[PDB]
């Protein structure tokens, strides 16, 4: 099942964001990405890819130019989180 809730994404999101050069250390749902954190194209891609490495959710090309806030990413993970299929050994024994 999908064990991630909204708070779990939000709590762990900051730690990744605390790992990159951010104008303010206060980040929540309302906080933006390009404006509040002053991130350009290449800067913002690293954080977006980094959240792909932790939340294990792939962002497509359609949402690429349509990301403007950090709450959207947190809500996006819930709609797009699945557990990787476990082999026959893990599932039933």
């Amino acid at each position: 099942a999908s064990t991630l809730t909204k708070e779990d994404v939000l709590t762990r999101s900051v730690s990744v964001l605390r790992g990159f050069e951010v104008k303010t250390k206060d980040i929540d749902l309302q906080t933006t990405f390009v404006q509040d954190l002053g991130m350009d194209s290449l800067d913002l891609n690293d954080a977006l890819v980094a959240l792909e490495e932790e939340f294990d959710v792939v962002f497509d090309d359609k949402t690429a130019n349509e990301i403007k806030t950090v709450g959207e990413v947190v809500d996006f993970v819930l709609a797009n989180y699945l557990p990787t299929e476990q082999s026959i050994n893990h599932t039933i024994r």
């Binding site: 891609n45 690293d46 977006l48 890819v49 690429a64």
Partner: protein, 115 residues
Amino acid sequence: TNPTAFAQTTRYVKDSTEMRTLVLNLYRRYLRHSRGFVNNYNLDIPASQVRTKIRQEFERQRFVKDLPLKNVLYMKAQMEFQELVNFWKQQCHVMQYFESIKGDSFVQKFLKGAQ
């Protein structure tokens, strides 16, 4: 005939804005495969190092201006992506790719032989 993995048609893009978005997705594609490039080629540098070098590669040549020369730079960078992701370059070439690289005063160059 069936084209290989990670192939794209060679198209002469006639828009300034579309090329901007094509590049941005491409840069993410390199970062997505950051873990793989370490495990595939057995590179001595960790995953964060490769992203650092990839960023140094993408930051380097972002200021080009000619659209006819934009497509050429996007075409060949696609080949570099396709060659690397398909695991085509040998191990040695990737190791030496990241292993490449202040000058000296005139007296220093005069004595040994300069160029």
